Structure 1
């Protein structure tokens, strides 16, 4: 059984919510949870890893993510 990695999601206001995900988890789930907790529609936000857009069906494995990596959230363009 694989382990959770813990990712830090940084908001435009520098707030942080951390999420534990497995390496094969689709990141849509993280995006939806984050948007829910911010009180905004998921499609109003864009989520970036090292500046690149995170797709709904990206996984941490596909993105090469590791423990304590950062996701930045910006308003959708």
Structure 2
């Protein structure tokens, strides 16, 4: 566990996470998903406008301490 991130959501709902730069972010998502009780696929995580893939990594994206990972909800329109 090297970095501490802030996973903020559209309604301002924050949630801190201590993660291993060595690891995939999928894990961070799964936990955010349940810690919220929201189906995986209904959410989208972005870092500075860039969508965070599953096998993506803190080191890869180059996230400094206390960086924000923004969460967005599925959109639809008619």
Deviations 1:13-41 (A, max 9, x none): 10110011111110000000001011111
Deviation at 1:60, TM superposition (A): 0.4
What RMSD, in angstroms, separates the aligned Cα atoms of the two structures?
1.0
In 2: Cα distance, 1:47 partner to 1:12 partner: 11
Which structure has the bigger radius of gyration? 2
The CA deviation at 1:44 is 0.6
| 4+ long deviations beyond 4 Å | none
Q: What TM-score do the two structures reach when normalised by structure 1? A: 0.91
Q: Distance in 1 between matches of 2:27 and 2:74?
A: 18
Structure 1 unaligned blocks of 5 or more: none
Question: What is the distance in 1 between the residues matched to 2:5 and 2:56?
Answer: 14
User: Given the two structures, how large is their TM-score scaled by the length of structure 2?
Assistant: 0.90
How many residues of Structure 1 are paired with residues of Structure 2 in the alignment? 75
